[PDB]
Amino acid sequence: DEVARTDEWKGAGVSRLREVWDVQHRVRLRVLWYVNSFWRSRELSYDDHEVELYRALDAYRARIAVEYVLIRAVRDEIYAVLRRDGGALPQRFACHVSRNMSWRVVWELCRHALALWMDWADVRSCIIKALTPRLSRGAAAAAQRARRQRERSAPKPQELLFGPRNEPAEQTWYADVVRCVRAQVDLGVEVRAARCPRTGLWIVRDRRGRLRRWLSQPEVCVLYVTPDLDFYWVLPGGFAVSSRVTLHGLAQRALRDRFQNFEAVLARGMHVEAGRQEPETPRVSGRRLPF
Amino acid sequence: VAVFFEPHEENVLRCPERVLRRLLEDAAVTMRGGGWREDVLMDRVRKRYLRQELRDLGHRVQTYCE
Amino acid sequence: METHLYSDLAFEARFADDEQLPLHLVLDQEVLSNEEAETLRYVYYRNVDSAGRSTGRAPGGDEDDAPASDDAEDAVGGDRAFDRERRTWQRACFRVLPRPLELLDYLRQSGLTVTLEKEQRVRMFYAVFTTLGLRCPDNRLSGAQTLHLRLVWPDGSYRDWEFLARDLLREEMEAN
Amino acid sequence: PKDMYLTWEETRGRLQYVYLIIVYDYDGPETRPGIYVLTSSIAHWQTLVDVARGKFARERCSFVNRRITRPRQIPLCTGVIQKLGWCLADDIHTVVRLDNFSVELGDFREFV
Amino acid sequence: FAATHNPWASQAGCLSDVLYNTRHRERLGYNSKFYSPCAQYFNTEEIIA
């Protein structure tokens, strides 16, 4: 009888159940240990010197710290350009203002909101979420093509009179809303934005088109980031300070290890055609009989 | 009745008479070196692993003594 | 249950090309919510080595150590960084049981014979049976390795849990 | 015969075709072939074979189990379909027998 | 039964194509009043039609 490995696998049973935690002690998942695995019959050696654990903890520290050192770089850039201009900032966002108004207290509230936002930074925030489309698959040719289409010459009448017809006035902006009447900070916020054609400033609405109405509230402050990594930090009254976010003091494979945007493969219920309207999810559920 | 100003690209808010800019620079340089909010997570996991291995030393000193 | 045997035999048959070792897991309500476990598309693991980067790259040196330098054109390297980041993950098998159960009584309701030292009758509302791989470079194995569990839902979002190799084999490697 | 009759239906299809199905369960030492007479509303052969595969995958895993547990002994088949004809949903009579029966002596069509 | 007896004047995208295919002369800019006696040989936007 050439008896199968499956029956001796089951009848050999499982030795013991051992649970384990993660490093941050957030999840706690359990591990089985079957005796009839081939894990036993390879005769593995095992050892852990402490210097390797120290280097492992340092590498894991870097992997956790890449986001917060990016946020610290953002704060340093804010303070750098705020020292650089000399304290005089323009209004880059459309809001009607009054002249007789106390403005030193708005500066105090702006410093307060800046310290509060630095206290409550997280990996689920503006710059990380705006960075995730930049790490994608077709980002290189898309940015190259947008650069070439931006840097195209003035068209001659030949391509206007016989060539093909020519051709994104709104942008997908990401926002961190902080607020000091309640010390409530709001992290993952999406804002549709474009220019006001009557002037040269920006108009910020919802995806529904709400005309986002926190800018008139005197206590909030917002951080805006654009997909081309342009930077904005807007105190009430429409005045704001601008920069570029600088990530050049950071490694590349750390940025791809941490929050590189995901690419999916084909499972059941998915179109082998690329990009049609898919049907519903597979949805293996316990409410129904599982069929 | 209400009076206001229409926004522009040439209206500028000035520095707050450099009496609040200096405390802005103070808050800039008092937090260049401090809590980085990076090794706080390392602090938590080091404290927790240290508690774990110290309790393991307790189990070892309680059983291996017999 | 049924995926653990298959992955055991698969890692046995694939052992000489990569010396991965099977790691049979169960996840429950302490990890992810039931709404997340009902639409869980697939899992992902990666045997990051002890001191450095990962398994899916060159051992010494690469072209990903450079700064990103804040450019628009090749924002992070280009497509080759995407290929290196996609290559380093491996897809583990996947089986989810979205009904409440007890693990030992489930395995005794299947053909297995659990002989635990004392009745740690664990109860749960939904059991997803996953099975990762962890590498040994030579036939020895360092405890300073780490894992990266990646759980993917079809919207594109994910979650990541990480844990070392030392706590995984704190007793079971010492039991052999 | 009430023992050999079975279905996977509410038997509310109009034209009930019939099908002889035997299997080869190798959970016994030699063979335990479960002979069966099967009505169905479905008439096409291939999709019926797919539904039967969905219903009889335990015999398929038993078939592969026989193949691994005994290499020298050849496994013959797994099962053979053969239609006999078709009737109407009211022609059944609870031993369940049929009053009218159109005949169609079809072929031994195997399946795994 | 050779391939081409004038390989500067036959390939789609050659000189005498782009000098005389009328679509390319529209994309170059030309006076339509001037008659060209090579237009009847290179109008493969319409010769194919």
Please describe what this structure looks like.
The structure is cut from a larger assembly and holds 2 copies of chain A, 1 copy of chain B (66 residues), 1 copy of chain D (112 residues) and 1 copy of chain E (49 residues). Chain A is of the alpha+beta class and 291 residues long. Chain A has 7 helices and 10 strands. Chain A has a 6-stranded antiparallel sheet with strand order 7-6-5-8-9-10. The longest helix of chain B has 25 residues. In chain D, strands 1, 2, 3, 4, 5 and 6 form a 6-stranded mixed sheet that branches. Chain E is built from 2 helices and no strands. The termini of chain E are far apart. Chains in contact: A-B, A-C, A-D, A-E. Strand 4 of chain A pairs antiparallel with strand 1 of chain B, so a sheet runs across the interface. Chain E: This is Major capsid protein. Chain B: It comes from Human cytomegalovirus (HHV-5). Chain B: This is UL77 protein.
The counted number of beta strands of chain A is 10
Helix coverage percent of residues of chain A? 25-40%
Largest interface: A-C, 80 and 93 residues
Number of strands of chain E: 0
Report helical residue fraction of chain E. 10-25%
Helix count of chain A, per DSSP?
Answer: 7
Query: What is the chains' assembly state?
Result: part of a larger assembly
Please state the CA-atom Rg of chain A, rounded to the nearest Å.
27 Å
Q: What is the H/E string of chain E?
A: HH
Instruction: Write out the strand line-up for the largest beta sheet of chain A, numbering strands in chain order.
Output: 7-6-5-8-9-10
Report the end-to-end length of chain E measured between terminal Cα atoms: 25 Å
**Total of helices of chain E:** 2
Write the H/E string of chain A, N to C: HEEEHEHHHHEEEEEEH
Instruction: Label the overall shape of chain E.
Output: globular
Q: Which structural class matches the secondary elements of chain A? A: alpha+beta
Give the N-to-C terminal Cα separation of chain A: 36 Å
Strand coverage percent of chain E:
under 5%
- Report the sheet with the most strands of chain A, covering strand number, pairing sense and barrel closure: 6 strands, antiparallel
Note the main sheet of chain E. Answer: none
Q: Percent of residues of chain A in beta strands?
A: 15-25%
Protein name (chain B): UL77 protein
Organism (chain E): Human cytomegalovirus (HHV-5)
Protein name (chain E): Major capsid protein
Keywords (chain D): Capsid protein, Host nucleus, Virion
